[PDB]
Design a protein around this nucleic acid. Sequence first.
RNA 1: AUUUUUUA
Lengths: 60, 64, 62, 60, 61, 60
Amino acid sequence: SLQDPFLNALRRERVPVSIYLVNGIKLQGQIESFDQFVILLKNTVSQMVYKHAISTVVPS
Amino acid sequence: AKGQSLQDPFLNALRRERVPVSIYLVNGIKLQGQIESFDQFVILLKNTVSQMVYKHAISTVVPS
Amino acid sequence: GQSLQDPFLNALRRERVPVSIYLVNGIKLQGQIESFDQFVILLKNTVSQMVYKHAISTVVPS
Amino acid sequence: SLQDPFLNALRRERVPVSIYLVNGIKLQGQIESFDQFVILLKNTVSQMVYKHAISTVVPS
Amino acid sequence: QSLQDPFLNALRRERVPVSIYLVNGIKLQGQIESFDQFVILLKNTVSQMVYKHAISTVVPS
Amino acid sequence: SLQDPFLNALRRERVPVSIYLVNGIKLQGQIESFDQFVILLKNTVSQMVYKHAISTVVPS
RNA sequence: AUUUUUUA
Ligand SMILES: Nc1ncnc2c1ncn2[C@@H]1O[C@H](COP(=O)(O)OP(=O)(O)O)[C@@H](O)[C@H]1O
Ligand SMILES: Nc1ncnc2c1ncn2[C@@H]1O[C@H](COP(=O)(O)OP(=O)(O)O)[C@@H](O)[C@H]1O
Ligand SMILES: Nc1ncnc2c1ncn2[C@@H]1O[C@H](COP(=O)(O)OP(=O)(O)O)[C@@H](O)[C@H]1O
Ligand SMILES: Nc1ncnc2c1ncn2[C@@H]1O[C@H](COP(=O)(O)OP(=O)(O)O)[C@@H](O)[C@H]1O
Ligand SMILES: [Mg+2]
Ligand SMILES: [Mg+2]
């Protein structure tokens, strides 16, 4: 897996990310955690985002 | 993390604590209600009535 | 923590409940649940139409 | 299965059908054949339609 | 795959110009160079790899 | 698999690529790596693109 | 373990 090391590194270092959704919505926050099918993105609140809804995960 | 170690406990906490949730769909529609039950593939969301939402249609689940 | 799909659809079918099936593109279909399997739901209104589950957002009584 | 008898009946009876795609396009023709993942729709030409792109198959 | 594979293989072997409609309505054109379970390689000016999950319809042009 | 050799050749030769997403957005960069589910695309940053959100990969 | 990252 490349996916898991990528997401874990972002999580560990609290890297600001943008998550672009397939419908054109852009979310921002930090990767709090993730598992097989979802990513927990935290900004003001923790929201569970389904991977099937995501196009890209983009660090800044 | 592996398997369902994030998703299942997240959804179960919402269900157990009867937390008002927003469920954003892939078409940008926001549903609201309480999580009555869920399985691997669907969530039963209760507001006025029970509706079966396919997880494949869901973008994001977050407390309201 | 068992399967929810077939019990939910079966109840709607058996009770003859008018349902709305919203698709992932927001289109709302209406009718009676006639039957269903692993992949599809047959929705009866003026005709029987076969709806792919992969395209369904929500099934709810109208 | 309910899918296979439904499509076989349309194919056998040469019923004019509408195939609605998830992107809102409506295709019309006759069910020529189908397998696990595709439906062949015949109008002036035979076109191969991926089931994943289809929302509903409706007699016209 | 008794329908899909022979349909695509006939297009490929006979080097038939095809149109591939994507789920976003974009129409690609070219000849099918090869395919596997998940992608189709489409050749026009260059070779591009098209994911089947993004394709609605394949038809001869 | 035709997919892996195609992506590997673009990666190894450091070919600038265009990745078109299913919503029509065009991403550009170099393929850094890929696995079953994702492609890591490098430009100003390394971003992770889910294959499910990709329509086409082509040299730019 | 009913297509919850995957040509129904
Ligand atoms: N996580 C998400 N997934 C899908 N759509 C979203 C998400 N967040 C917001 N949207 C959609 O983007 C649009 C603008 O969102 P915004 O007004 O910021 O949030 P809200 O409408 O919930 O207060 C709304 O149509 C909303 O449904
Ligand atoms: N659960 C759902 N899934 C997908 N689309 C939905 C859902 N609920 C409503 N919509 C769509 O969102 C748009 C606005 O909804 P709304 O006017 O509230 O419809 P309704 O009156 O049927 O609830 C409509 O196109 C509708 O079909
Ligand atoms: N056989 C088909 N399968 C899927 N989509 C189609 C088909 N034919 C047309 N479309 C879509 O519908 C839109 C308009 O159709 P049409 O007027 O026939 O354009 P064209 O002549 O370029 O196919 C196009 O943007 C195209 O993406
Ligand atoms: N292979 C493709 N897959 C998905 N979308 C595409 C593809 N080719 C073009 N598009 C969409 O159509 C638009 C116009 O096409 P074109 O001008 O050829 O692309 P470009 O943006 O590279 O100039 C693009 O901006 C893109 O949104
Ligand atoms: Mg079960
Ligand atoms: Mg999937």
